[PDB]
């Protein structure tokens, strides 16, 4: 019953190739796949393109005029392993902490490589 | 009774870099107690206060921020006045009894 | 004095020379009495007379 | 007592179908195209009456050696069906089109129509703030040429939300929208949306869950179970909360009688003193810890990351974006923009003030507009009125947006573009109305 | 017996902008507590006493309207992470209005 279950939501939610949904004419082409990486490149360089063959036009609402623009108040630095208030920083692999015991039992002994999983969060890797 | 914040330890390496006029000067600080080990980013006035009051490497600093004083206490074991190295933590909140005549 | 002392493309020679003795004070003594608050009339008293 | 968590109940009964004697071929159809979950229904009702999340399976049947698809609520009939749904997008954008085109031809055979040569129902459709023209010019693409739509138009749902609490079309407000994968600030100035002031920040709900997966699996290296997104979404849910003030709150987040009270204990599923350690007290709470328990090794302990999981849309810094907050944002646009001197705000600001709206997913956090509302009189001049608007559900809001302003046919009319608009001007071709995009360029 | 009154002015300062006509004719100073903003216009003598405390932008102030009296409570702690080490003191802002008034 389990097993056959699902068949009956899959004989009732199907649509066959020629569809009832869809127009007459097709004619459908072929896609890439197109992630979102390059979406922003394309977009980026299209802007640039027609930026410089306007110089040889003011943006006024676009993907990268859009975007929030960096602080201007000083950040609040915090321990690494805790979340807590940040007095300390480590000398040799960067990583805040908030007091000796954290320092001694987890900053010190840990392995290499575990010093860019801890700044991965902050993006200070 | 009143409570103060003090920083105590040894001094492992000071870097001040200057530019040609001097107008602005960066700077880093390395101190530790024999728990802990940290890295300070210095402001203008801390690094025109760690000049004057000349401090080398292997010196027992202590250093209020609030006023701005820094007083040597000496230099460490390291014979190559002779202090130990402080431990537990490096910031310490440490109360002060007054006792405080009237005549005062 | 206690100064700031050497322990042995310029110098820096600044002036750095106190008194070994220190008198001690609260900031209690200070902030209630010689500084003005919302809680002493210092000012009041000083402009009045 | 430790609570133990699991993945949600699947749906029992299958989702249904409205009745197809009742379609009719003129109403318009409304689709909220969100990333996280689809909304449709028809224009005359109030709410949706489809409501399912944003995914697809292709279930490949050993038997009968067919490729059947499961989409939306229908996913969720069994466990080994739910983890292998796939999403149309990847990240804020869709960057598939034909599992985006077979949920579009689902969610139409579950509204009931009866159609002919393509759609005979205008379509009501979203589009995020300052989109790529790959995207517009693919949704015209799909949409009238496969679908031979008679009429199309296009909006922001924050925008479309503020016509639904606002339907004058005339006001003067500040939308903040929590989404999925973004949060938006949209300064709105006589029902118009001004979009050459709107700010972006890259944080959701999504990567709010992410955190909270990369904070869990980095407290607890040798944890042996390995939790899937839907838990981790469900802590998020219930222990999770926006504090009212985040600098005094760390301070004593770990200590022995705020831990009594605010630590959540969560079991995953299966088959010298320590009062003077903030270490064992951020790891193992304000209880004994007996390492050789089989119950205590599949434990996580929720104490400091219920108030630093939501706290990132205020410093986006500790998630690793450098973009300034909400408040701060807020505090450029109501202080050095729209005519305002710093310590002067004129008329334009002070009716933006007074209407600031709350709306999105992401809404659903305690705390945010009690903490809004404390920045706001924080940075504002004393005596100001500051009023904060939340829906009951914001998540709905969209929607109610498209009934509204589908309900209103004087003001409709200035936003669709039909077909003999769109092949007279092409795919690269904005409607600059109030409530949808604007031009890229002056 | 004298009757007098107590109008304080407290809190961090946002905006110092003096303006002139070698001589500066006023300043215009912001100032900031948790319950709001308020702006000030003060003529030049205070602004002297001003610069003779060392006041800057992010500085919690104390100013008397009567006398004219300026004390520097200190730097906020919004400004607090500016360097890892300073020699400046970090007060938090005034959970109170700007302006108080007492008889």
């Known amino acids: 019953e389990r097993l056959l279950f699902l068949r009956s939501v899959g004989e009732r939610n199907e649509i066959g190739f020629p569809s009832r949904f869809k127009s007459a004419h097709y004619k459908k082409p072929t896609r890439r796949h197109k992630s979102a990486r390059q979406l922003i490149s394309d977009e980026n360089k299209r802007i640039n393109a027609l930026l410089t063959k306007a110089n040889k036009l003011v943006p006024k609402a676009t993907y990268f005029s859009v975007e929030a623009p960096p602080s201007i108040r000083p950040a609040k630095k915090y321990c690494d392993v805790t979340g807590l208030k940040g007095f300390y920083k480590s000398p040799t692999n960067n990583i805040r902490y908030h007091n000796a015991e954290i320092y001694q039992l987890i900053v010190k002994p840990m392995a290499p490589g575990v010093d860019q999983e801890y700044l991965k969060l902050r993006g200070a890797n | 009774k009143e409570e103060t914040e003090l ?25 530790k107690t024999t728990d802990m080990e940290t890295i300070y980013e210095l402001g203008n006035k801390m690094i025109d206060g760690l ?41 310490k909140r440490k109360t002060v009894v007054h006792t405080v005549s009237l005549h005062e | 004095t206690t100064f700031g002392k050497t322990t042995s493309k310029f110098t820096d020679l600044i002036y750095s020379s106190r008194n ?11 902030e209630d009495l010689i500084l003005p608050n919302y809680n002493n009339d210092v000012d009041i008293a000083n402009k009045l007379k | 007592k430790a609570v133990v968590i699991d993945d949600p109940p699947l749906r029992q009964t299958p989702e249904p179908f409205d009745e197809q004697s009742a379609y009719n071929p003129q109403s318009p159809i409304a689709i909220d195209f969100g990333s996280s979950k689809l909304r449709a229904g ?40 739910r983890s292998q749904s796939r999403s149309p997008f990847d990240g804020p954008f869709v960057t598939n089109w034909n599992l985006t085109e077979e949920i579009l031809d689902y969610t139409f055979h579950h509204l009931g129509v009866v159609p002919d040569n393509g759609i005979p129902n205008p379509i009501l459709l979203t589009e995020r703030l300052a989109t790529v023209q790959s995207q517009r010019t693919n949704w015209y693409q799909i949409l009238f040429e496969t679908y031979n739509v008679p009429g199309v138009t296009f909006g922001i749902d924050s925008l479309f939300s503020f016509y639904n609490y606002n339907p004058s079309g005339n006001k003067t407000g500040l939308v903040i929208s929590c989404g999925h994968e973004d949060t938006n600030v949209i300064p709105v100035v006589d029902g ?83 009062r003077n350690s903030i270490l064992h007290l951020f790891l193992r709470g304000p209880r004994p810890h007996d390492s050789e328990n089989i119950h205590e090794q599949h434990q996580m302990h929720l104490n400091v990351e219920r108030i630093r999981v939501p706290e990132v849309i205020f410093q986006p810094t500790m998630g690793g974006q450098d973009q300034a907050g909400i408040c701060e944002l807020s505090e450029t646009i109501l202080l050095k923009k729209f005519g305002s001197q710093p310590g002067k705000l004129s008329q334009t600001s002070i009716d933006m003030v007074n209407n600031v709206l709350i709306t999105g997913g992401n809404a659903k956090v305690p705390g945010l507009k009690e903490r809004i509302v404390k920045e706001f009189t924080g940075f504002l001049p004393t005596g100001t009125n500051i009023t904060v608007n939340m ?3 914001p998540s709905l809001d969209a929607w109610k947006g498209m009934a509204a302003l589908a309900r209103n046919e004087e003001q409709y009319r200035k936003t669709v573009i039909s077909k003999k608009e ?21 | 017996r004298i009757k007098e009154t107590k109008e304080v002015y407290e809190g961090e300062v946002t905006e110092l902008t003096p303006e002139d006509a070698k001589t500066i004719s006023h300043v215009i100073v912001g100032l900031k507590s948790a319950k709001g903003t308020k702006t000030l216009r003060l003529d030049p003598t205070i602004y002297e006493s001003i610069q003779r405390e060392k006041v800057s932008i992010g500085d919690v102030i104390y100013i008397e309207a009567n006398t004219g009296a300026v004390k520097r409570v200190g730097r906020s702690d919004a400004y607090a992470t500016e360097f890892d080490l300073e020699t400046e003191e970090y007060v938090p802002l005034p959970k109170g209005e700007v302006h108080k008034k007492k008889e």
């Open chain 4, 391 to 393: 829906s009951s559900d």
């Open chain 4, 192 to 274: 118009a949306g001004i979009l050459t002031d709107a700010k972006r920040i890259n944080w959701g709900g999504h990567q709010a869950v992410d955190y909270l997966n990369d904070l869990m699996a980095l407290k607890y290296p040798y944890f042996p179970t390995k939790m899937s997104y839907l838990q981790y979404e469900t802590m998020y849910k219930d222990y999770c909360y926006v504090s009212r003030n985040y600098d005094e709150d760390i301070e004593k987040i770990l200590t022995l009688e705020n831990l009594d009270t605010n630590d959540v204990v969560v079991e995953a599923p299966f088959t010298y003193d320590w």
């Open chain 2, 7 to 31: 920083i105590e330890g040894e001094v492992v390496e000071i870097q001040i870099d200057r530019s040609i006029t001097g107008g602005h000067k960066q700077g880093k600080l390395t101190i």
């Open chain 4, 42 to 81: 028809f224009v005359n009702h109030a709410t949706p009456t489809h409501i399912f999340p944003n995914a697809l399976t292709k279930f490949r049947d050993r038997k009968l050696n067919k490729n059947f698809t499961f989409v939306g609520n229908d996913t969720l009939l069994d466990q080994a069906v």
């Open chain 3, 20 to 30: 070994p003795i220190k008198y001690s004070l609260p900031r209690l003594i200070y």
């Open chain 2, 51 to 91: 000049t004057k009051e000349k401090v080398l490497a292997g010196d027992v600093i202590s250093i209020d921020k609030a006023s701005g004083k820094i007083t040597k206490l000496g230099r460490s074991f390291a014979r190559s006045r002779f202090v130990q190295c402080p431990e537990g933590e490096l910031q």
């Open chain 4, 422 to 442: 769109y092949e007279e001007y092409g795919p690269e071709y904005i409607k600059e109305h109030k409530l949808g995009n604007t031009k890229y360029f002056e």
